[PDB]
Enzyme design. Structure first.
Site, PDB file in Angstrom:
ATOM      1  N   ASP A  44       0.823  -1.208   0.000  1.00 29.54           N
ATOM      2  CA  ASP A  44       0.000   0.000   0.000  1.00 29.54           C
ATOM      3  C   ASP A  44       0.849   1.248   0.000  1.00 29.54           C
ATOM      4  OD1 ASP A  44      -2.764   1.307   0.460  1.00 29.54           O
ATOM      5  OD2 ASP A  44      -1.546   2.269   2.003  1.00 29.54           O
ATOM      6  N   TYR A  49       2.990  10.156   0.640  1.00 31.53           N
ATOM      7  CA  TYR A  49       3.983   9.560   1.541  1.00 31.53           C
ATOM      8  C   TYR A  49       5.390   9.953   1.108  1.00 31.53           C
ATOM      9  CZ  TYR A  49       0.054   6.485   2.837  1.00 31.53           C
ATOM     10  OH  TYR A  49      -1.185   6.007   3.214  1.00 31.53           O
ATOM     11  N   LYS A  78      -2.652   6.130  -4.238  1.00 29.28           N
ATOM     12  CA  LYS A  78      -3.773   7.013  -3.903  1.00 29.28           C
ATOM     13  C   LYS A  78      -3.588   8.413  -4.487  1.00 29.28           C
ATOM     14  CE  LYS A  78      -3.775   4.732   0.727  1.00 29.28           C
ATOM     15  NZ  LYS A  78      -2.307   4.512   0.858  1.00 29.28           N
ATOM     16  N   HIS A 111      -7.807   9.353  -2.089  1.00 30.81           N
ATOM     17  CA  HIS A 111      -7.220   9.253  -0.731  1.00 30.81           C
ATOM     18  C   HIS A 111      -8.156   9.745   0.388  1.00 30.81           C
ATOM     19  CE1 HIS A 111      -2.912   9.014   1.164  1.00 30.81           C
ATOM     20  NE2 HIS A 111      -3.819   8.712   2.075  1.00 30.81           N
ATOM     21  N   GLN A 184     -10.843   1.936   1.742  1.00 24.71           N
ATOM     22  CA  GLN A 184      -9.768   1.801   2.724  1.00 24.71           C
ATOM     23  C   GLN A 184      -9.976   2.780   3.871  1.00 24.71           C
ATOM     24  OE1 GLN A 184      -5.111   2.993   3.154  1.00 24.71           O
ATOM     25  NE2 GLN A 184      -5.474   1.515   1.493  1.00 24.71           N
ATOM     26  N   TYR A 210      -6.926   0.136   7.605  1.00 26.04           N
ATOM     27  CA  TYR A 210      -5.678   0.823   7.876  1.00 26.04           C
ATOM     28  C   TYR A 210      -5.483   1.062   9.379  1.00 26.04           C
ATOM     29  CZ  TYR A 210      -7.475   5.884   7.804  1.00 26.04           C
ATOM     30  OH  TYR A 210      -8.087   7.108   8.028  1.00 26.04           O
ATOM     31  N   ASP A 217       2.944   4.961  16.611  1.00 25.56           N
ATOM     32  CA  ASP A 217       3.957   6.012  16.517  1.00 25.56           C
ATOM     33  C   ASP A 217       3.437   7.320  15.918  1.00 25.56           C
ATOM     34  OD1 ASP A 217       7.125   6.826  15.193  1.00 25.56           O
ATOM     35  OD2 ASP A 217       6.746   6.435  17.320  1.00 25.56           O
TER      36      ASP A 217
HETATM   37  N1  LIG Z   1      -5.819   5.885   3.505  1.00 21.58           N
HETATM   38  C1  LIG Z   1      -5.448   6.578   4.594  1.00 21.58           C
HETATM   39  O1  LIG Z   1      -5.862   7.714   4.791  1.00 21.58           O
HETATM   40  C2  LIG Z   1      -4.508   5.941   5.589  1.00 21.58           C
HETATM   41  C3  LIG Z   1      -4.398   6.406   6.892  1.00 21.58           C
HETATM   42  C4  LIG Z   1      -3.516   5.761   7.769  1.00 21.58           C
HETATM   43  C5  LIG Z   1      -2.790   4.657   7.325  1.00 21.58           C
HETATM   44  N2  LIG Z   1      -2.907   4.220   6.047  1.00 21.58           N
HETATM   45  C6  LIG Z   1      -2.149   3.062   5.526  1.00 21.58           C
HETATM   46  O2  LIG Z   1      -2.180   1.972   6.448  1.00 21.58           O
HETATM   47  C7  LIG Z   1      -0.853   1.633   6.858  1.00 21.58           C
HETATM   48  C8  LIG Z   1      -0.866   1.126   8.304  1.00 21.58           C
HETATM   49  O3  LIG Z   1      -1.319   2.144   9.199  1.00 21.58           O
HETATM   50  P1  LIG Z   1      -0.326   3.000  10.165  1.00 21.58           P
HETATM   51  O4  LIG Z   1       1.023   3.072   9.487  1.00 21.58           O
HETATM   52  O5  LIG Z   1      -1.077   4.277  10.423  1.00 21.58           O
HETATM   53  O6  LIG Z   1      -0.232   2.241  11.591  1.00 21.58           O
HETATM   54  P2  LIG Z   1      -0.170   0.679  12.044  1.00 21.58           P
HETATM   55  O7  LIG Z   1       0.189  -0.222  10.886  1.00 21.58           O
HETATM   56  O8  LIG Z   1      -1.403   0.449  12.872  1.00 21.58           O
HETATM   57  O9  LIG Z   1       1.107   0.735  13.022  1.00 21.58           O
HETATM   58  C9  LIG Z   1       2.426   1.036  12.563  1.00 21.58           C
HETATM   59  C10 LIG Z   1       3.338   1.197  13.775  1.00 21.58           C
HETATM   60  O10 LIG Z   1       3.353  -0.017  14.543  1.00 21.58           O
HETATM   61  C11 LIG Z   1       4.680  -0.560  14.581  1.00 21.58           C
HETATM   62  N3  LIG Z   1       4.608  -2.031  14.406  1.00 21.58           N
HETATM   63  C12 LIG Z   1       4.451  -2.693  13.241  1.00 21.58           C
HETATM   64  N4  LIG Z   1       4.405  -4.018  13.502  1.00 21.58           N
HETATM   65  C13 LIG Z   1       4.531  -4.191  14.837  1.00 21.58           C
HETATM   66  C14 LIG Z   1       4.561  -5.316  15.652  1.00 21.58           C
HETATM   67  N5  LIG Z   1       4.436  -6.563  15.141  1.00 21.58           N
HETATM   68  N6  LIG Z   1       4.715  -5.144  16.987  1.00 21.58           N
HETATM   69  C15 LIG Z   1       4.828  -3.913  17.492  1.00 21.58           C
HETATM   70  N7  LIG Z   1       4.814  -2.800  16.744  1.00 21.58           N
HETATM   71  C16 LIG Z   1       4.657  -2.928  15.400  1.00 21.58           C
HETATM   72  C17 LIG Z   1       5.432   0.160  13.479  1.00 21.58           C
HETATM   73  O11 LIG Z   1       6.804   0.271  13.871  1.00 21.58           O
HETATM   74  P3  LIG Z   1       8.059   0.098  12.875  1.00 21.58           P
HETATM   75  O12 LIG Z   1       7.600   0.592  11.514  1.00 21.58           O
HETATM   76  O13 LIG Z   1       9.093   0.985  13.530  1.00 21.58           O
HETATM   77  O14 LIG Z   1       8.462  -1.361  12.835  1.00 21.58           O
HETATM   78  C18 LIG Z   1       4.770   1.512  13.388  1.00 21.58           C
HETATM   79  O15 LIG Z   1       5.332   2.432  14.353  1.00 21.58           O
HETATM   80  C19 LIG Z   1      -0.105   2.931   6.678  1.00 21.58           C
HETATM   81  O16 LIG Z   1       1.328   2.760   6.700  1.00 21.58           O
HETATM   82  C20 LIG Z   1      -0.672   3.385   5.354  1.00 21.58           C
HETATM   83  O17 LIG Z   1      -0.130   2.532   4.335  1.00 21.58           O
HETATM   84  C21 LIG Z   1      -3.754   4.837   5.212  1.00 21.58           C
HETATM   85  O1  LIG Z   2      -2.528   8.049   4.224  1.00 18.50           O
HETATM   86  C1  LIG Z   2      -2.605   8.779   5.371  1.00 18.50           C
HETATM   87  C2  LIG Z   2      -3.273   9.989   5.399  1.00 18.50           C
HETATM   88  F1  LIG Z   2      -3.857  10.484   4.292  1.00 18.50           F
HETATM   89  C3  LIG Z   2      -3.339  10.718   6.564  1.00 18.50           C
HETATM   90  F2  LIG Z   2      -4.012  11.883   6.494  1.00 18.50           F
HETATM   91  C4  LIG Z   2      -2.742  10.251   7.731  1.00 18.50           C
HETATM   92  C5  LIG Z   2      -2.953  10.965   9.033  1.00 18.50           C
HETATM   93  C6  LIG Z   2      -1.890  11.370   9.820  1.00 18.50           C
HETATM   94  F3  LIG Z   2      -0.634  11.145   9.423  1.00 18.50           F
HETATM   95  C7  LIG Z   2      -2.090  12.028  11.018  1.00 18.50           C
HETATM   96  F4  LIG Z   2      -1.027  12.394  11.746  1.00 18.50           F
HETATM   97  C8  LIG Z   2      -3.366  12.299  11.463  1.00 18.50           C
HETATM   98  O2  LIG Z   2      -3.566  12.947  12.652  1.00 18.50           O
HETATM   99  C9  LIG Z   2      -4.433  11.902  10.685  1.00 18.50           C
HETATM  100  F5  LIG Z   2      -5.681  12.158  11.092  1.00 18.50           F
HETATM  101  C10 LIG Z   2      -4.226  11.237   9.485  1.00 18.50           C
HETATM  102  F6  LIG Z   2      -5.277  10.851   8.761  1.00 18.50           F
HETATM  103  C11 LIG Z   2      -2.073   9.025   7.687  1.00 18.50           C
HETATM  104  F7  LIG Z   2      -1.469   8.486   8.760  1.00 18.50           F
HETATM  105  C12 LIG Z   2      -1.990   8.315   6.512  1.00 18.50           C
HETATM  106  F8  LIG Z   2      -1.311   7.150   6.460  1.00 18.50           F
END
Ligand SMILES: NC(=O)c1ccc[n+]([C@@H]2O[C@H](COP(=O)([O-])OP(=O)(O)OC[C@H]3O[C@@H](n4cnc5c(N)ncnc54)[C@H](OP(=O)(O)O)[C@@H]3O)[C@@H](O)[C@H]2O)c1
Ligand SMILES: Oc1c(F)c(F)c(-c2c(F)c(F)c(O)c(F)c2F)c(F)c1F
Length: 316
Positions: A44, A49, A78, A111, A184, A210, A217
């Site tokens: 993804d 990004y 996206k 997005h 998503q 997601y 973090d």
């Molecule tokens: N469409 C949108 O608007 C949107 C919004 C938010 C996210 N996303 C997508 O969804 C993906 C995932 O969401 P996210 O990045 O927000 O958060 P997440 O996947 O819920 O959590 C990521 C964090 O957890 C840590 N982590 C990963 N695996 C772990 C494990 N097995 N044990 C403990 N900690 C672990 C990572 O650390 P390390 O990386 O340091 O290992 C990172 O700090 C994003 O990267 C992005 O691709 C999309």
């Molecule tokens: O794809 C993403 C996005 F569009 C975001 F806005 C965020 C996002 C963010 F970085 C943040 F820090 C936020 O406070 C929030 F609300 C978000 F939606 C994000 F984490 C993503 F991975």
């Protein structure tokens, strides 16, 4: 290997993918390489990004080393809402595709539904940090994105952070060519999205979860904010299976037929996060986990809440 969710197009979308938000340059390339080696086929990505060029490097490397074939990868990006104007949809997509070094994307997502001031300032904002809107809408965007599908540059379109009202607006637009294959959205035991998942599934739209680990973090985390990974009740279920909390949080979505995209750049965690096809959460455990719903978002995007198409006002 890892299982898939069949889309309305019949394409098979791998049910675990690798998130890349805030994966740093210098780490994201190795992260993508380790994930492909570990069996990930779904990655993804996004324009916003600003690391697609490094993801592109890694994918190319693995393809030219015969570790994987393009057809077996499932690559999602996206369109950012500063690019909803028709000609910018093309320019933005072209930069994503060139950075990723690919000839097509498997899925291209809107997005966020709310449009921002058009241009290459990705975060146009006022003095308080509130987003500045643009007049181009997600429907304008979709219109231009549909050309990419006509041209074979993208296999399917989808949306992200859409409420059911906005998906209805999309599906009910006369003259629609293509339907979204996925929505998503944030999803985890504190935000279980029951009504929205039920809606999407009833329309032939899959859900991609997601922040499934509660994005521990996120730079805006307050110590009083809930922490899924440290939740004793999540950890209890993990213990019962001799698995980690993260593995339970990921398996939760697989059992609901929801695609899930945990992010990591840590090789051990990247591997751990896909070791989720050798245990099963029982009906009672799934029920317990669902009961944890708090309607809590790690991703509120409150600085855009005044905008017309801000998605989180609606119940679902
Ligand atoms: N469409 C949108 O608007 C949107 C919004 C938010 C996210 N996303 C997508 O969804 C993906 C995932 O969401 P996210 O990045 O927000 O958060 P997440 O996947 O819920 O959590 C990521 C964090 O957890 C840590 N982590 C990963 N695996 C772990 C494990 N097995 N044990 C403990 N900690 C672990 C990572 O650390 P390390 O990386 O340091 O290992 C990172 O700090 C994003 O990267 C992005 O691709 C999309
Ligand atoms: O794809 C993403 C996005 F569009 C975001 F806005 C965020 C996002 C963010 F970085 C943040 F820090 C936020 O406070 C929030 F609300 C978000 F939606 C994000 F984490 C993503 F991975």
């Amino acid at each position: 290997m890892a299982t898939f969710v069949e889309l309305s197009t019949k394409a098979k979308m791998p049910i675990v993918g690798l998130g890349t938000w805030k994966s740093p340059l210098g780490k994201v390339k190795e992260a993508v390489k380790v994930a492909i080696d570990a069996g990930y086929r779904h990655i993804d990505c996004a324009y916003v990004y600003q690391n697609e060029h490094e993801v592109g490097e890694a994918i190319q490397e693995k393809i030219q080393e015969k570790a994987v074939k393009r057809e077996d990868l499932f690559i999602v990006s996206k369109l950012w809402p500063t690019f909803f104007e028709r000609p910018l949809v093309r320019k933005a997509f072209e930069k994503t595709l060139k950075d990723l070094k690919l000839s097509y994307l498997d899925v291209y997502l809107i997005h966020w539904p709310q449009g921002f001031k058009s241009g290459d300032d990705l975060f146009p904002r006022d003095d308080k940090g509130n987003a500045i809107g643009g007049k181009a809408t997600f429907l304008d965007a979709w219109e231009a994105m549909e050309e990419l599908v006509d041209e074979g540059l993208v296999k399917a379109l989808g949306v992200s952070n859409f409420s059911h009202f906005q998906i209805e607006k999309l599906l009910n637009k006369p003259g629609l060519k293509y339907k979204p294959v996925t929505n998503q959205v944030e999803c985890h035991p504190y935000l279980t999205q029951e009504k929205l998942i039920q809606y999407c599934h009833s329309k032939g739209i899959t859900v991609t979860a997601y922040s499934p680990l509660g994005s521990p973090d996120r730079p805006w985390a307050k110590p009083e904010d809930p922490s899924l990974l440290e939740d004793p009740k999540i950890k209890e279920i993990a213990a019962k299976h001799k698995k980690t909390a993260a593995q339970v949080l990921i398996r939760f979505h697989i059992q609901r037929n929801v695609i899930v995209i945990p992010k990591s750049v840590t090789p051990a965690r990247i591997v751990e996060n896909i070791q989720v096809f050798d245990f099963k959460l029982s009906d009672e455990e799934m029920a317990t986990i669902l009961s944890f719903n708090r309607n809590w978002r790690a991703c509120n995007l409150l600085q855009s809440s005044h905008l017309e198409d801000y998605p989180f006002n609606a119940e679902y």
